[PDB]
Design a protein around this ligand. Structure first.
Ligand SMILES: *[C@@H]1O[C@H](CO)[C@@H](O)[C@H](O[C@@H]2O[C@H](CO)[C@@H](O)[C@H](O)[C@H]2NC(C)=O)[C@H]1NC(C)=O
Ligand SMILES: *[C@@H]1O[C@H](CO)[C@@H](O[C@@H]2O[C@H](CO)[C@@H](O)[C@H](O)[C@H]2NC(C)=O)[C@H](O)[C@H]1NC(C)=O
Ligand SMILES: *[C@@H]1O[C@H](CO)[C@@H](O[C@@H]2O[C@H](CO)[C@@H](O)[C@H](O)[C@H]2NC(C)=O)[C@H](O)[C@H]1NC(C)=O
Ligand SMILES: CC(=O)N[C@@H]1[C@@H](O)[C@H](O)[C@@H](CO)O[C@H]1O
Ligand SMILES: *[C@@H]1O[C@H](CO)[C@@H](O)[C@H](O)[C@H]1NC(C)=O
Ligand SMILES: *[C@@H]1O[C@H](CO)[C@@H](O)[C@H](O)[C@H]1NC(C)=O
Ligand SMILES: *[C@@H]1O[C@H](CO)[C@@H](O)[C@H](O)[C@H]1NC(C)=O
Ligand SMILES: *[C@@H]1O[C@H](CO)[C@@H](O)[C@H](O)[C@H]1NC(C)=O
Ligand SMILES: *[C@@H]1O[C@H](CO)[C@@H](O)[C@H](O)[C@H]1NC(C)=O
Ligand SMILES: *[C@@H]1O[C@H](CO)[C@@H](O)[C@H](O)[C@H]1NC(C)=O
Ligand SMILES: *[C@@H]1O[C@H](CO)[C@@H](O)[C@H](O)[C@H]1NC(C)=O
Ligand SMILES: *[C@@H]1O[C@H](CO)[C@@H](O)[C@H](O)[C@H]1NC(C)=O
Lengths: 167, 316, 167, 316, 167, 317
């Protein structure tokens, strides 16, 4: 019923990019992780701010459309312009493909670091389910869901019960 | 009981390319190659000249199509496809270089030289200009001597270029339509024109044309281009056919003028221009035209390159 | 006897690149994992398909070798050609070094994906040994080893004997 | 018990460059810089003309060695080191531009100029050009003044381009190599040549003197060329030294011309050639020659670059 | 309160780039590692040496600054030179940005490689706190701390003590 | 007990630019764009000719400023703004191509042309070129008519290149300051100079008239040149107003040229030079001069690009 980033995304998570889904006896719901989404979107925005940097170099026209240039110089110009076009087409495709690879891998890195943050916050009172779910071995409702989202949850809550529950 | 960490998804996203595979679906991506142009020239806030039947190269010479644009300042100079640089047919010997500096010249300022001799007739009857009647360019004289059976006098006219700016000197040589025209329009005998400077040292000789009837009249004008450094002197020593300039041309400053085929829109501003319109987007690349002027996106061949802005889209 | 990917590589896998090796009642079994291998090969193949691609921009001769060309335009052509050669030599050196770095990191990431997937399947029984292997506390026969090789393995049922042996 | 995870290895791999280490050993890698080539030009699927002992401009001028190529049609044009553009000594002006045009022309479609002459002799046979006896260029008419020691009449000929493609018109100027020979051949007096069209304007003057001996001759015939836009007309006004065209040359389509010193081979079917062989490969880079023509790898300085195809090699 | 790694860092580490800091009751203190430091610095120096990229292509002087060249070829040279300069400015900014991203990611991944090595080397005898420390349940002083600082540590002799705790 | 891992951090640090974010703090970074220069030419180890008042093209024709450079041999050629290519007013035609040829030439090896003249004055001189009071280019002959206001006979001269290297042959065409000057010297009539070889053919005509005074005499000489292939011949045919070569110029080898305004330094060895100095650096980029020539960093427009050498400087509480 409930599955995380390992196998699928959440089609219903519109407010925010990263978040936590709570399935319990004490209700059910979804809430976004403000800091993770804010970091990812500001970091990607910075990437776009780099991409849209202007050249700040004005280029004059060298060739002439209305009246042709001399064939010798025109052919040298077309050779140079085509070589420059090939260089910029290569650089544009390599940059877009490489940055798309970095954007996807970066988003996965953010997913893994947030996942590990949760794992290291829960420590021995929770276990991974291998799908993105964490199995919680103590009874708890939304108060600790918020404490996890707020990075305030402490594991010192009847640890012995969770160990007995998983030993 | 159970908690879950996950990420957003959409029922149908967009496809971007990566280093290892093609067609990778992501929730959101933007374009890095601009495809949408503005059909009009965005010149708002900048001084412009919308030069029509006159070409840019004619702003020195003064064809009747732009007599009113002989002297101006401009930030953006626009030449049109229909533009012509001649009244009487002719061509510039170094046409592209002079056009290249005019597009970078910022406009034009002028200062009279002289040629205050006798035996010469300024009008130079041409039937290709009808502003009032037969005439030649506003800024040049046809030194035709005393009509028929009139030998041409020897002239040695120089200009000192006293201002600090370099001087753009444009003059020409008339190739008549026949030998009879050389004999009766400029007189019998040989024709020699020698132009001196500290760095020019070039002579020219006209020849009988016997050319096709381009714009009715046969023959051609050679428009010769000279640059002077500050305080230099241009010397025109000649007895042959000669088209005498009245005024030297000087530069104004920056222009980056663009050749264009579309109307001017003074209510929009931008810096990238091409012959088919303008680019006002801030994307890093375009596939609209490689022949861009100004602070323009770099030209690429791919129609579109999508840059991911979201994460990998894995639907439920 | 047999070490994993952290300590060293292993000579002997002829079919595929990635695999599993184990000690059990049968002894020193070896098998390849063809799904992670095909994933890595598909990504490398796509990378080479992008790199091993020829352009469609045709270039003609600008200068001649049978007769010399005008010296000033010839030197401008040679300078432009040499600058383009420097640009493509830089781009080729950077492309090969960067893509080789991505290929090596790709292979290590795929090895890590296999390692992590096994860890997540094993849960409390994973017992990483620091050499790139997993110590199995329950007595695991050939059928459970095969179940680990593919993606259908139950961490339960074994947990009781595994934890009695582990603790 | 124990389950171990790992990867394959090889006993002897290859070395590749990375971002942190220049010599990282990998299990497998391929080459990205091609050094292998085929010693012969590949023509399968393309129409190929092999100009053995013939220069490309001899397909326009028509020396005896080029007699079979006056109307050649080909996709690939091969020039040879041992070939020549002329048989009677001389040079083309802007010969590089003309070769650049011809190498892409698709071949040459010759069409008669239709010039009729009177008062001259149209033979001009010379000992340097032979076709079982003295001859001249197949496509050029060397026009002499009657027999000898007589003035050459001035003639003004013209040609109109009525086809959709631009017409290539080629003519020459004969520098006799001696003032006495020029005055015996074309008579005494000053000589003058004017040639022009709506976008072309040139004049030439014969220059007698003394020159070295090539193929037993002392004179030199230089060749000039003009492009005519569709529906344009060219004029030729001469007082002698016509070296007149007999046929206009039209471009058939598109081609890619090459220089080569090696034999042509039908079987390979390659897409890119260089002097000395053909480069048939799918690799992105080459280290064979920088002057490559076609759609083929970009030249790099590196002899070899190895692109890893497997994972890194840990030899144990 | 010595938990620098996840959040604060160590501003007091003098001898190396990576190290160990100890909370042991006998007296707290800091020591540096040299092997992961030497590896990271060797890779970074390798990057700087690769990035020297000294050219062996001799470029002559084409544009004359004392007497100007013909304006059409002059502008051809200026356009070609400015396009080449834009290509090299792009390549330099992209190369530096890539190398800085890879240098930071490499150094952080090297700190993660050391961290993971310590966690696996300690097996189940230590628990992550999630701020940048390992909580060691067995108390030890010179032999265990030297063994952990080194790449050789025997986790068996302390396995019973660590497993007796927490439960 | 607690075992903490961590990393070296600094209280100050520097900033670098990354692909994703600008201004990322790092503990240490270096520069990849060289901004430092040496305001002098590091010519150590190379034979260097410091052409102070001598323009490079005058090292072929030999104006007084180039008296000591007529047969110069050097690995490095330094040109300066204050120098001149000519002494008698004039210029070279296709002067940039000839300068480019000379800069890599390795120096000049002159061989006697072997032209024997009779019936003319071969000792012409001008007040603008004063080697000892009144002289002309040392390596070229100013050929005048037998007497002033007298005919100059037409002559044909030729040279065969018997060396394995091609010869650089330079000749001048004298454009008189007046029709009287072209009548007083050389005699009346139309003048013509024709030059040719198996693969070369040009014809030049002097044009008298009037010009402004430059460096004294209001005349001009246009200096033309050709390359002569091995085993070929050159024929010069002239009726006057032709400045004949006295010696053929062969190229010695390989060199590079510099245009600069700075002192030559023979105690330091550098890799490339520019108008303001020498660039000695092992950094891949420079932001000082886009037209530096030699084997040295590529020019970028970035004032400084900081390449991290340390890791990200996360500050400590
Ligand atoms: C454009 O081309 C002109 C000549 O055609 C050249 O003068 C420009 O650069 C010149 O560079 C010199 C040294 O770098 C400098 O001293 C000179 O002032 C400068 N020209 C001008 C007008 O400022 C060429 N442009 C570039 C960017 O090199
Ligand atoms: C260099 O390439 C340009 C186009 O990239 C050529 O100009 C085009 O030529 C085609 C066919 O004649 C026309 O339909 C286009 O309108 C032309 N465009 C422009 C902007 O001129 C140009 O002729 C080529 N130069 C040479 C010497 O072949
Ligand atoms: C431009 O570079 C080419 C080399 O790519 C030069 O061609 C060489 O010229 C020398 C002249 O002696 C020959 O010996 C070589 O065999 C030529 N090599 C090739 C591959 O053609 C060419 O001369 C250079 N042009 C200029 C003006 O310097
Ligand atoms: C004009 C000229 O250079 N001729 C030479 C000739 O003297 C020489 O003997 C021969 C090689 O044997 O090459 C040729
Ligand atoms: C967590 O933070 C939210 C605000 O983001 C607040 O409304 C909520 O009460 C907090 N819960 C806890 C347990 O701190
Ligand atoms: C997704 O599907 C809907 C269905 O109507 C369609 O309207 C929309 O354009 C699609 N979007 C994409 C990106 O495919
Ligand atoms: C994609 O990003 C743009 C901003 O660039 C935003 O306006 C748009 O809503 C986003 N769409 C989705 C589906 O995230
Ligand atoms: C995994 O391998 C075992 C070994 O026989 C097999 O029975 C099982 O069906 C395999 N799983 C899948 C999904 O094929
Ligand atoms: C590398 O892969 C290619 C793929 O065609 C193969 O031909 C070659 O033999 C392989 N080399 C090694 C050493 O595995
Ligand atoms: C040339 O002019 C004729 C006039 O009858 C016209 O029919 C023809 O289409 C024109 N051709 C071109 C290419 O303009
Ligand atoms: C362990 O580390 C200590 C330093 O704390 C060192 O003196 C000792 O030699 C090391 N031993 C081994 C086996 O590496
Ligand atoms: C930073 O790196 C440079 C590398 O050239 C080195 O010289 C410098 O000493 C380093 N500084 C510090 C504080 O590590």
């Amino acid at each position: 019923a409930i599955a995380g980033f390992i196998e699928n995304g959440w089609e219903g998570l519109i407010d925010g990019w990263y978040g936590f889904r709570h399935q319990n006896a004490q209700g059910e719901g979804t809430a976004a992780d403000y800091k993770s989404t804010q970091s990812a979107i500001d970091q990607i925005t910075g990437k776009l701010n780099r991409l849209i940097e202007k050249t700040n170099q004005q280029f004059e026209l060298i060739d002439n459309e209305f009246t042709e240039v001399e064939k010798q110089i025109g052919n040298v110009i077309n050779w140079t312009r085509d070589s420059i076009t090939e260089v910029w087409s290569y650089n544009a495709e390599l940059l877009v493909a490489m940055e798309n690879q970095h954007t996807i891998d970066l988003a996965d890195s953010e997913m893994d670091k947030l996942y590990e943050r949760v794992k290291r916050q829960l420590r021995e009172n929770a276990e991974e389910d291998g799908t993105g779910c964490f199995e919680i071995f103590h009874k708890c409702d939304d108060d600790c869901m918020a404490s996890i989202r707020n990075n305030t949850y402490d594991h010192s809550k009847y640890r012995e019960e969770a160990m007995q529950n998983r030993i | 009981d159970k908690i879950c960490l996950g990420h957003h998804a959409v029922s149908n996203g967009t496809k971007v390319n990566t280093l290892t595979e093609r067609g990778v679906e992501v929730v959101n991506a933007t374009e890095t190659v601009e495809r949408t142009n503005i059909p009009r020239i965005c010149s708002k806030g900048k001084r412009t000249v919308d030069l029509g039947q006159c070409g840019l190269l004619g702003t020195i010479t003064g064809p009747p199509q732009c007599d009113q644009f002989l002297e101006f300042s401009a930030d953006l100079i626009i030449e049109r496809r229909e533009g012509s640089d001649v009244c009487f047919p002719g061509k510039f010997v170094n046409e592209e270089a002079l056009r290249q500096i005019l597009r970078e010249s910022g406009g034009i300022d002028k200062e009279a030289m002289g040629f205050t001799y006798s035996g010469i007739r300024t009008n130079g009857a041409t039937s290709s200009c009808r502003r009032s009647g037969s005439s030649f360019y506003a800024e040049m004289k046809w030194l035709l001597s005393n009509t028929d059976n009139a030998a041409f006098p020897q002239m040695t006219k120089s200009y000192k270029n006293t201002r600090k700016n370099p001087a753009l000197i444009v003059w020409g040589i008339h190739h008549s339509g026949s030998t009879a025209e050389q004999t009766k329009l400029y007189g019998s005998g040989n024709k020699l024109v020698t132009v001196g400077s500290s760095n020019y040292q070039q002579s020219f000789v006209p020849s009988p044309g016997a050319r096709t009837q381009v714009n009715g009249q046969s023959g051609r004008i050679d428009f010769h281009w000279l640059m002077l450094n500050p305080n230099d002197t241009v010397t025109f020593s000649f007895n042959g056919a000669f088209i005498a300039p009245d005024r030297a041309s000087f530069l104004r400053g920056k222009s980056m003028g663009i050749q264009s085929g579309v109307q001017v829109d003074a209510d929009c501003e931008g810096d990238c221009y091409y012959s088919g319109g303008t680019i006002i987007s801030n994307l890093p690349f375009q596939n609209i035209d490689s022949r861009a002027v100004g602070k323009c996106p770099r030209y690429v061949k791919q129609r579109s390159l999508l840059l991911a802005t979201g994460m990998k889209n894995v639907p439920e």
